[PDB]
Structure 1
Amino acid sequence: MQIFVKTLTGKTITLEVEPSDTIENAKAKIQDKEGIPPDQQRLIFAGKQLEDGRTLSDYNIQKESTLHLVLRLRGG
């Protein structure tokens, strides 16, 4: 199985994840794909922001769920 990760570009990344694919590990998977250091990686789900330490099983995330990916870059 696999879940979906949508970015501000509209690109939906599909990957395989387990209940130990915690935001910490998940951030690493995306990094190897986009090259964005976990520092610029922000996972949002249900308008709620996720924190490092909780697992997909803890947030009740499914194996097909859709995750919202956001990048940190302020300046205006």
Structure 2
Amino acid sequence: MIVFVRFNSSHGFPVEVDSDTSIFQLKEVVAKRQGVPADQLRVIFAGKELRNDWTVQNCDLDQQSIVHIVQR
């Protein structure tokens, strides 16, 4: 499935993930795209930060929903 990533109020670009993709994996691909370290990234969704070990489906991420990712 696709997840939209808003990186510091930037225009939401899509990230294809799997049902079992970890948040950290998502942090990685974003980090590769944004040229930043994956450790300085936080994933905000539905009023809760998503922990690195949580899977996409665990977080109740629906197809083509949006996750905000901030820095530091």
TM-score by length of 1: 0.83
- Which protein is bigger by CA-based radius of gyration? 1
Question: After the TM superposition, which segments of 4 or more aligned residues of structure 1 sit over 2 Å from their partners?
Answer: 7-11
Query: Normalising by the residue count of structure 2, what TM-score does the alignment of the two structures yield?
Result: 0.87
User: Superposition RMSD on alpha carbons, in Å?
Assistant: 1.3
Unaligned runs of 5+ in 1: none
Tell me the equivalent position of 2:33.
33
**CA separation in 2, counterparts of 1:35 and 1:47?**
26
The CA deviation at 1:36 is 1.3
**In 2, Cα distance between the equivalents of 1:10 and 1:28?**
17
Structure 2: 5+ residue stretches without partners: none
Q: Secondary structure at the match of 2:51?
A: coil
Percent identical across equivalent pairs? 32
Q: Please state which structure has a larger fraction of its residues in strand.
A: 2
Partner of 1:55: 55
Give the SS at the match of 1:53: coil
Q: Offset of 1:59 from its aligned partner?
A: 0.9
SS in structure 1 of the partner of residue 26 of structure 2: helix
